[PDB]
Amino acid sequence: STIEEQAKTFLDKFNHEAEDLFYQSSLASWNYNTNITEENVQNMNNAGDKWSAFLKEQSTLAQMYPLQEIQNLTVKLQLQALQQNGSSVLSEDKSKRLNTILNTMSTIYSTGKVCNPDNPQECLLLEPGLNEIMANSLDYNERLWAWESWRSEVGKQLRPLYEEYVVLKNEMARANHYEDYGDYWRGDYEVNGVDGYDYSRGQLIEDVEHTFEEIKPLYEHLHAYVRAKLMNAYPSYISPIGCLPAHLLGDMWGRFWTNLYSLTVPFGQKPNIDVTDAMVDQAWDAQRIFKEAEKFFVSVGLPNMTQGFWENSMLTDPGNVQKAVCHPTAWDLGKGDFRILMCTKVTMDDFLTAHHEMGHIQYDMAYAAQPFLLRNGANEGFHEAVGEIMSLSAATPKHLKSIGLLSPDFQEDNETEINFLLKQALTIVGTLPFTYMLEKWRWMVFKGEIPKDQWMKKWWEMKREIVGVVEPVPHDETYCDPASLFHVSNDYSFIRYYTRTLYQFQFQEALCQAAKHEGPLHKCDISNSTEAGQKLFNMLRLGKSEPWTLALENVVGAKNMNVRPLLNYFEPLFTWLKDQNKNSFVGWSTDWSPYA
Amino acid sequence: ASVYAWNRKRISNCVADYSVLYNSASFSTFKCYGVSPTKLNDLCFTNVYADSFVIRGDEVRQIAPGQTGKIADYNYKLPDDFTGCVIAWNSNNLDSKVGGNYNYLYRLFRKSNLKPFERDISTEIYQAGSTPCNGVEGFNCYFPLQSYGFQPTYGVGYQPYRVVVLSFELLHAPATVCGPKKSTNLVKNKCVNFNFNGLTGTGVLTESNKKFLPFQQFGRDIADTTDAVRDPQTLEILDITPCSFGGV
Numbered sequence: 001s002t003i004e005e006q007a008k009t010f011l012d013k014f015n016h017e018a019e020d021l022f023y024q025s026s027l028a029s030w031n032y033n034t035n036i037t038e039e040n041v042q043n044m045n046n047a048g049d050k051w052s053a054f055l056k057e058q059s060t061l062a063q064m065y066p067l068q069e070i071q072n073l074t075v076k077l078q079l080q081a082l083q084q085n086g087s088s089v090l091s092e093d094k095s096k097r098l099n100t101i102l103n104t105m106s107t108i109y110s111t112g113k114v115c116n117p118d119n120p121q122e123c124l125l126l127e128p129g130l131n132e133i134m135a136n137s138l139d140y141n142e143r144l145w146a147w148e149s150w151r152s153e154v155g156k157q158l159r160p161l162y163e164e165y166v167v168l169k170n171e172m173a174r175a176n177h178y179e180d181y182g183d184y185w186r187g188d189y190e191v192n193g194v195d196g197y198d199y200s201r202g203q204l205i206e207d208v209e210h211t212f213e214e215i216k217p218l219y220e221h222l223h224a225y226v227r228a229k230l231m232n233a234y235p236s237y238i239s240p241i242g243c244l245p246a247h248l249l250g251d252m253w254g255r256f257w258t259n260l261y262s263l264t265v266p267f268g269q270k271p272n273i274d275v276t277d278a279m280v281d282q283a284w285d286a287q288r289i290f291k292e293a294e295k296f297f298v299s300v301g302l303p304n305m306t307q308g309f310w311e312n313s314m315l316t317d318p319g320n321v322q323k324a325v326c327h328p329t330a331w332d333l334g335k336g337d338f339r340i341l342m343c344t345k346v347t348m349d350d351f352l353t354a355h356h357e358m359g360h361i362q363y364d365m366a367y368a369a370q371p372f373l374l375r376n377g378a379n380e381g382f383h384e385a386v387g388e389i390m391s392l393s394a395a396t397p398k399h400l401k402s403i404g405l406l407s408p409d410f411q412e413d414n415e416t417e418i419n420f421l422l423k424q425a426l427t428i429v430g431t432l433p434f435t436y437m438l439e440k441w442r443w444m445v446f447k448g449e450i451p452k453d454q455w456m457k458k459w460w461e462m463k464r465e466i467v468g469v470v471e472p473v474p475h476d477e478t479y480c481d482p483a484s485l486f487h488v489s490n491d492y493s494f495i496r497y498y499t500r501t502l503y504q505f506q507f508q509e510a511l512c513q514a515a516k517h518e519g520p521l522h523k524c525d526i527s528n529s530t531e532a533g534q535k536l537f538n539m540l541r542l543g544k545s546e547p548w549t550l551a552l553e554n555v556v557g558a559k560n561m562n563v564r565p566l567l568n569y570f571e572p573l574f575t576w577l578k579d580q581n582k583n584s585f586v587g588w589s590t591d592w593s594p595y596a
Numbered sequence: 597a598s599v600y601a602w603n604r605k606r607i608s609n610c611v612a613d614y615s616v617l618y619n620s621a622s623f624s625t626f627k628c629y630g631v632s633p634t635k636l637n638d639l640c641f642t643n644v645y646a647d648s649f650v651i652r653g654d655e656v657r658q659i660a661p662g663q664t665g666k667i668a669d670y671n672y673k674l675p676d677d678f679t680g681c682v683i684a685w686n687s688n689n690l691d692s693k694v695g696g697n698y699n700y701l702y703r704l705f706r707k708s709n710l711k712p713f714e715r716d717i718s719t720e721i722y723q724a725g726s727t728p729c730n731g732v733e734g735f736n737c738y739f740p741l742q743s744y745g746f747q748p749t750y751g752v753g754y755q756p757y758r759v760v761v762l763s764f765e766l767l768h769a770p771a772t773v774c775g776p777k778k779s780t781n782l783v784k785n786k787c788v789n790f791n792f793n794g795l796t797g798t799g800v801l802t803e804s805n806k807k808f809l810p811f812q813q814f815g816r817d818i819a820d821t822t823d824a825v826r827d828p829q830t831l832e833i834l835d836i837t838p839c840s841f842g843g844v
């Protein structure tokens with residue numbers, strides 16, 4: 001007789017049918033991804049279209065139960081995700097045009113090649129090709145050539161498509177009662193209907209700026225040290241006062257600076273933390289890696305993995321004709337079916353990536369008791385930070401001596417910690433200005449503050465303002481330089497990587513406060529302390545059933561995103577950089593001094 | 597059977613070996629709520645009702661007195677005064693199908709809770725609103741029966757578990773189901789304590805020349821003392837001489 005019981009019966013019916021169809025869709029996606037076959041592609045398309053049609057029909061049926069008369073907050077959380085119309089609010093021809101634009105942008109991004117002008121004889125794709133020449137090569141001219149060629153090709157091929165994608169997504173979000181598509185992207189962090197714990201979606205652009213104004217001295221010192229060190233390899237191309245060129249940052253886009261560590265190592269004469277020689281001399285295997293990682297998880301107090309995880313995962317390259325997508329992906333197919341698809345070899349990087357993917361699997365296991373709408377992360381940063389907890393903890397020398405892998409008399413002096421914290425800085429605090437810059441640029445573009453004839457001018461100035469990187473040659477609006485990245489060309493929100501990089505240090509600080517670690521935060525280990533695992537599992541089991549402010553406050557005691565754990569993590573590195581930059585020009589002004 | 601249409605089998609006039617059932621290690625769950633296996637071997641019961649169905653692994657805990665859940669409310673309700681056993685084992689090697697075994701249904705929506713040991717195979721459309729269904733599916737009218745997936749790649753808690761519930765009961769009737777009688781070897785010509793078909797005593801059991809008629813089991817003298825008996829295992833007649841006590 002009431003709206004509550006009708007909504008609860010509708011949600012039970014949707015949960016059972018959606019779990020069934022989502023298991024079918026995820027099994028089809030798994031069968032496609034571990035074994036590329038055109039029949040598997042057709043099965044995956046059929047299952048995805050069945051799930052899309054089912055979700056559209058239940059989104060149509062969910063509008064009849066109004067949210068204004070519902071008092072239960074979990075029913076509100078389950079029904080807001082259903083009553084969102086999405087792209088179906090448009091006309092059929094506009095939705096078809098938007099989907100066609102998305103698929104053609106994906107195919108043109110995937111099918112790029114690095115063939116030289118006037119030398120078309122042979123080339124590769126980006127992953128065997130451009131990754132090697134931009135990450136590992138020490139030459140200036142070939143890096144500049146590959147960079148300019150790829151940005152030029154993707155710019156002419158995607159500048160109309162990305163412009164029309166912006167226009168259609170803006171019309172979609174204005175039709176769906178949001179201000180812009182960036183405002184739609186900030187709806188994942190929105191909390192409403194809870195007094196005190198509520199979080200406006202316009203408060204995210206305040207908190208991100210507030211945390212970046214305290215990131216920015218550490219990034220200025222890191223940029224000054226990198227600029228001072230990189231003149232040894234590039235003497236005439238880099239000015240001592242101006243900004244860095246774009247193609248020398250150890251990546252295609254400068255997203256991760258982690259390949260610049262070999263060029264900027266502080267103390268090369270010290271022995272390294274690289275355990276790969278002892279890992280291959282002890283004859284490790286992928287099963288041994290996952291067993292030691294599962295021992296690491298059960299030492300913290302999280303439950304061990306099911307027999308279906310061991311019997312169904314793909315932990316090795318299957319063979320000759322069974323090609324697989326070698327990217328590390330943790331799969332939650334639902335109904336207790338957790339598995340990892342990751343091609344492995346004996347490597348410390350694959351060890352840490354296995355810890356990352358089993359962190360994702362454990363987080364999928366923890367909210368498995370929740371209903372189907374609430375089986376996701378509290379926001380889009382939680383689900384990627386929970387694996388990075390394991391990635392930070394598994395890299396420590398205490399953990400690598402716990403499993404007997406690192407040598408027991410390896411001494412943790414000052415230099416062997418500074419040159420590890422610098423690698424962690426290039427991995428973590430190097431991606432914060434690029435992420436905040438790119439998402440600020442996308443929010444201003446989708447908001448309409450930047451016209452189409454000022455996209456690139458505003459972007460490179462913003463790059464000069466935030467990241468401290470100048471263009472190698474001057475570019476104009478004939479190119480679309482940011483859209484060459486994987487996430488922006490495939491309709492992925494990208495600010496998830498900013499809050500992840502802050503939440504991982506908040507959670508680890510809380511879980512190092514719980515584990516009673518006396519020493520520094522970078523030497524802290526989560527292992528052997530069940531009281532840290534209970535603190536973590538009290539938040540991992542909630543899912544979307546609770547606001548992310550309350551789930552954050554359950555761990556760290558603060559109901560907002562905070563930046564102080566990241567600063568006091570890098571405090572010995574920050575003091576060493578402040579004592580190192582006695583006479584170098586710390587920071588920068590925006591300039592064209594290294595190149596006009 | 598499926599749990600909305602669970603099979604009930606009436607068991608009477610037989611001897612039941614629960615020790616093979618208990619000693620079988622294949623059963624993942626063996627909960628008895630008013631009996632013990634030794635008690636099951638030593639209690640004679642009038643009726644044994646075997647209720648059989650397939651559920652998930654998570655639903656196994658709902659098969660108990662005083663439990664609440666979709667199986668325990670809308671499919672199979674056990675009373676609070678239940679005297680019986682619940683036996684459950686994983687049937688992934690038989691029930692699961694690689695394309696999905698949709699053949700095992702369960703009732704998701706019902707107007708009211710079940711009475712204990714009620715069964716309701718009716719496919720009446722659940723009317724959750726004031727709007728009438730008129731049989732057809734609508735925005736508030738749902739089909740009450742839903743299919744289990746039962747794929748072999750499911751995790752534990754979604755894997756299919758075959759459950760058999762045995763209900764034992766004593767009525768105002770002669771009880772006939774009773775546990776395995778463990779007869780020992782027969783020793784003759786010695787003063788032993790004999791227990792022959794419920795007739796107990798102490799005596800020397802020797803061979804007898806008294807030829808019983810086939811319906812007769814025991815033998816009495818003038819003084820109404822059992823001096824002849826028939827062995828139930830092998831149909832032979834034994835004299836019961838009292839043990840040779842005397843005055844000192």
Ligand SMILES: *[C@@H]1O[C@H](CO)[C@@H](O)[C@H](O)[C@H]1NC(C)=O
Pocket residue numbers: 035036037322
């Ligand atoms: C992978 O697909 C090929 C294509 O026919 C098939 O022959 C092979 O059996 C498949 N392997 C698995 C493990 O499904």
Ligand SMILES: *[C@@H]1O[C@H](CO)[C@@H](O)[C@H](O)[C@H]1NC(C)=O
Pocket residue numbers: 071072073074075
């Ligand atoms: C919503 O309803 C369920 C079931 O009736 C109840 O257990 C839960 O506490 C309710 N939630 C709120 C926030 O009232």
Ligand SMILES: *[C@@H]1O[C@H](CO)[C@@H](O)[C@H](O)[C@H]1NC(C)=O
Pocket residue numbers: 304305306307
């Ligand atoms: C998980 O740990 C429990 C606790 O000891 C153990 O009984 C079980 O066999 C373990 N599972 C696996 C797959 O090792």
Ligand SMILES: *[C@@H]1O[C@H](CO)[C@@H](O)[C@H](O)[C@H]1NC(C)=O
Pocket residue numbers: 398399402525527528
């Ligand atoms: C955890 O405790 C076990 C048992 O004493 C020990 O072998 C292991 O080295 C400990 N690990 C750490 C990191 O202290």
Ligand SMILES: *[C@@H]1O[C@H](CO)[C@@H](O)[C@H](O)[C@H]1NC(C)=O
Pocket residue numbers: 828829830831
């Ligand atoms: C009972 O079992 C005994 C065991 O030797 C057998 O000899 C006999 O034929 C059976 N039947 C009867 C009625 O005694």
